[PDB]
Design an enzyme around this catalytic site. Sequence first.
Site, PDB file in Angstrom:
ATOM      1  N   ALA C  73       0.826  -1.225   0.000  1.00 33.13           N
ATOM      2  CA  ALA C  73       0.000   0.000   0.000  1.00 33.13           C
ATOM      3  C   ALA C  73       0.861   1.277   0.000  1.00 33.13           C
ATOM      4  CB  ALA C  73      -0.978  -0.018   1.214  1.00 33.13           C
ATOM      5  N   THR C  74       2.112   1.231   0.488  1.00 32.02           N
ATOM      6  CA  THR C  74       2.957   2.417   0.388  1.00 32.02           C
ATOM      7  C   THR C  74       3.065   2.821  -1.083  1.00 32.02           C
ATOM      8  OG1 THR C  74       4.250   1.700   2.350  1.00 32.02           O
ATOM      9  CG2 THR C  74       5.278   3.409   0.899  1.00 32.02           C
ATOM     10  N   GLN C 181      -6.010  -0.945   6.093  1.00 33.02           N
ATOM     11  CA  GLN C 181      -6.470  -1.568   7.355  1.00 33.02           C
ATOM     12  C   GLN C 181      -7.945  -1.971   7.291  1.00 33.02           C
ATOM     13  OE1 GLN C 181      -4.616  -2.368   9.937  1.00 33.02           O
ATOM     14  NE2 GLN C 181      -2.818  -1.042   9.826  1.00 33.02           N
ATOM     15  N   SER C 201      -3.016  -3.518   0.907  1.00 38.39           N
ATOM     16  CA  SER C 201      -1.761  -4.144   1.381  1.00 38.39           C
ATOM     17  C   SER C 201      -1.983  -5.634   1.686  1.00 38.39           C
ATOM     18  CB  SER C 201      -1.189  -3.423   2.568  1.00 38.39           C
ATOM     19  OG  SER C 201      -0.168  -4.141   3.193  1.00 38.39           O
ATOM     20  N   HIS C 203      -0.060  -7.773   3.406  1.00 40.71           N
ATOM     21  CA  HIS C 203       0.363  -8.234   4.754  1.00 40.71           C
ATOM     22  C   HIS C 203      -0.527  -7.718   5.888  1.00 40.71           C
ATOM     23  CE1 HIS C 203       2.897  -4.970   6.372  1.00 40.71           C
ATOM     24  NE2 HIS C 203       2.838  -4.593   5.118  1.00 40.71           N
ATOM     25  N   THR C 241       8.413  -6.706 -13.167  1.00 41.46           N
ATOM     26  CA  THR C 241       7.987  -8.113 -13.202  1.00 41.46           C
ATOM     27  C   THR C 241       6.909  -8.350 -12.146  1.00 41.46           C
ATOM     28  OG1 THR C 241      10.145  -8.756 -13.972  1.00 41.46           O
ATOM     29  CG2 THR C 241       8.739 -10.522 -13.143  1.00 41.46           C
ATOM     30  N   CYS C 327       9.867   7.189  21.600  1.00 39.14           N
ATOM     31  CA  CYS C 327      11.096   6.356  21.515  1.00 39.14           C
ATOM     32  C   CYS C 327      10.812   4.953  20.955  1.00 39.14           C
ATOM     33  CB  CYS C 327      11.917   6.419  22.803  1.00 39.14           C
ATOM     34  SG  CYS C 327      11.501   5.240  24.110  1.00 39.14           S
TER      35      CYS C 327
END
Lengths: 125, 84, 401, 75
Positions: C73-74, C181, C201, C203, C241, C327
Amino acid sequence: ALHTQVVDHYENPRNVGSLDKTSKNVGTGLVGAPACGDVMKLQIQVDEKGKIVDARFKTFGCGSAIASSSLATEWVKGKTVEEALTIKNTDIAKELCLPPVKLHCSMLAEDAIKAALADYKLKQE
Amino acid sequence: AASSRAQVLALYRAMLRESKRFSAYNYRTYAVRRIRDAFRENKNVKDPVEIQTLVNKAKRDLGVIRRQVHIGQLYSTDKLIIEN
Amino acid sequence: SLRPLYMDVQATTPLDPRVLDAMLPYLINYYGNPHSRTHAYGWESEAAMERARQQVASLIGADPREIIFTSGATESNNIAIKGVARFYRSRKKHLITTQTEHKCVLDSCRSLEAEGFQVTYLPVQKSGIIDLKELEAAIQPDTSLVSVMTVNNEIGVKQPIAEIGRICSSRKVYFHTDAAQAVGKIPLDVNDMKIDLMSISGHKIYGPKGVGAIYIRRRPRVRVEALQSGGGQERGMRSGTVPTPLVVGLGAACEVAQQEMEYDHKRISKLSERLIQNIMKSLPDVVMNGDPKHHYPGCINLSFAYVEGESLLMALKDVALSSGSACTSASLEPSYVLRAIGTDEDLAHSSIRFGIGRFTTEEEVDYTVEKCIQHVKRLREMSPLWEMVQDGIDLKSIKWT
Amino acid sequence: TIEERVKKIIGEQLGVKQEEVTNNASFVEDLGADSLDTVELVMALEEEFDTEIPDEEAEKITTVQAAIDYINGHQ
Ligand SMILES: *P(=O)(O)OCC(C)(C)[C@@H](O)C(=O)NCCC(=O)NCCSC(=O)CCCCCCCCCCC
Ligand SMILES: O=C(O)CN(CCN(CC(=O)O)CC(=O)O)CC(=O)O
C-alpha cells in the site's frame, strides 16, 4: 532487541519510594516534564557527617529512564554529598549500555542527582 | 450424493484430528474452532447440491490442513508463553 | 525461550495457511515469468496472476481490469497521490487529505508541496472523524484529489467513505482511500462508496509482505501518470515483473477474507469488547482514543494515565504490542494521530495499541488484560505523577523544568 | 479422579450438570447431543485417556456406561 541491564531495574525494582521532604537531611530533585514523557523524582537522605545514607526514586518514563534514575539512586548511597556530585551521565549510560537515542535519560538522571543535592544544600544554611 | 452424511461426519473427524497436529498455537486453535463453527453453522442446509459444494470445499481444506501441518512441523518454533 | 503473544496485527499479520498453500506451487514448480508469452511456464504464471486479479476485484466490487498490482500500500498511495496530481498538473494544483493519514500519504503530499502543489490537511474532530461539511468547504475549482483512509492504523476509527465519495463525485473531484487496514475486515464496494482509487496491502490481510494493489476506476475513467518507468506492465501503470507467488498470495488472501469477513468481525467484536471492558472496569484513568461508535474493533488504542507507554510495553514482556510514545515508533517522532485528535501530550506518551485478529484467542485476550492491569498498577506505584495526584496535587498547576 | 473422569468429560462436552450424567443415559436420546457433538465427545475421550478409538468402536459408544466400559477396558 532485549536489553537485560535496563529491564532488570523494573523486574527487580530497588529503592522505589519516598523520603520525608520536610527533613533537613533530605534533598528532593524533581526534573523533566510529563509532556516530554520523562519525569524523575530522586530523594537522598544525608547523615550528620555528610554521607548519603539512603535514597529513593519514582520515575515516569521509558525503561531506560527508569533504569537511569534507579541506577543513580543506588549509586549515591554511601557517597558523600561532594562525591555524589561527581556521578556523570556518561557513567550511567556506560553501565546500562544506553544507545545514543537514550542518552538523554542518563542526563536527566544526572540532573536529578544534582537537583536533590542542591535541595539538601539549600536546607543547611 | 454418496451419503453426504457419512462423508460429512468422516470429514469432520478427519479435519479436527489433523488440525490438532498444527504445531503453531494460533493456526491450531483457529482451525479447530473454525471447523467446529462452520459445520454447526451449515448443519441445517437441505439442498443436496449445496451440501455437495460444502463437502467439496471441506475436502479441499483438509488437503490444505494436511500440507500446512506438515510444513509447520518442518519449520516449527518454541511454544507461546501461555502454552505453559 | 517461550514466545510472546502476538497482539500487533495492525503492524502486520501472520500468513493464513490457506494463503501459503496457494503460493507454494509458484515457489516450487510454477516459477515462470507471467510476462513470458511463448511458453507454458509463462502461460500458467500469467493465468495465476489473472485469477488473483479477479479475486482482488471480487472483494471490492471492481472489474479485474481496474486492479493494478504493486509492492504494497505504500507504493499504491504514492501512485494514487503523485500520479493523479501529476496528470492534471496543467489544470489542477490543489489536493485534500487529513492530519491522521498514514505517513506515505502525508509524505507524498509533502513532496507535492515542494513541487508547487497546494495541499489542505483537514483536521479531525476529537472522535478522530473528519467533519464532512469542512471537507465540502475545502474543495476548490482546481482541486484534483481527495484522499481519506478507510480505517486508521493507529486508533482504528472509520471515516465516512460513502459520504465522502458522494461529495467528491458530485463535484467531479477524484476520491482515493487508503484501505490498507479495512480490506477484508469491513465491507468495501467501490461503486456504492463512489471510490475512484483505493490502496490495498497484502500483509495487513493474512497475505504475504511485499505485495499490494491499487484500484483505479475505469468508468468514468480516472487518469494517473505512472511513477515506475519500464516496459509497460500492468497496463503501463506499474512497470516491472509482476511477482506471481506474491500476487497469488494476495488474491488468495482476498478470497479467504471475502468468505471469512462476517465470522471474523463477529468474533473480533466480542474479544474487543471483552478486552476494553475488562481493562476499564479494573483500572481508573484509562481512556479510549477514537470514537467507539465509528471504529474497527480489532484496533484498540488506550491511554493509561501516569504511566509512560514504552515502560508498559517493557513491563508486558510476553505480549507483542505497540505504543504511541516517541522512543518506540522507529525511535523518532511522537504520535501525530493522538495530537490531531487533541490528546494532551502526556497522555499521548501513555498510549498502547492492542491488535485482535483472525487467529487471536480468548485466552490470549484474558492473559493480556490480566498483565495489563497488574503492570499499570505497578508502574503507577513507581510513578511520581501518580504519587502527586494521590496526594491531591493538580499536575496542571506545576511549573516543570 | 476415578474412571468417571469419563462422566466429567461427557458433562463438559454436552453442557450437562454432573447430576444428569447417569450410567444409563444416551448422549442423543437423553443428553441432547447431535452427531457433531458425539464426534467431538469421542475425540475428547481419546484425548483425556491417551487412547485411539477407531470408527467401529466409536459407533458403539452411545451411552455413558458404554464410554466408561470402553475406557476401563483399554488401560
Ligand atoms: P448428526 O446430528 O446425525 O448429523 C450431522 C450432519 C451435519 C451430517 C447433519 O446435520 C446433516 O446431514 N446436515 C445436512 C447438511 C450438511 O451436511 N451440512 C454440512 C456440510 S459440510 C460443511 O459445512 C463443511 C464446512 C467446512 C469448514 C472448514 C473450515 C476450514 C478452515 C481451515 C483453516 C486453515
Ligand atoms: O485443540 C485446540 O484448540 C488446541 N490444542 C491445545 C492448545 N493448547 C496449547 C498446547 O497444546 O501446548 C492450549 C494451551 O496450552 O494454552 C489441542 C491440542 O493440544 O492438540
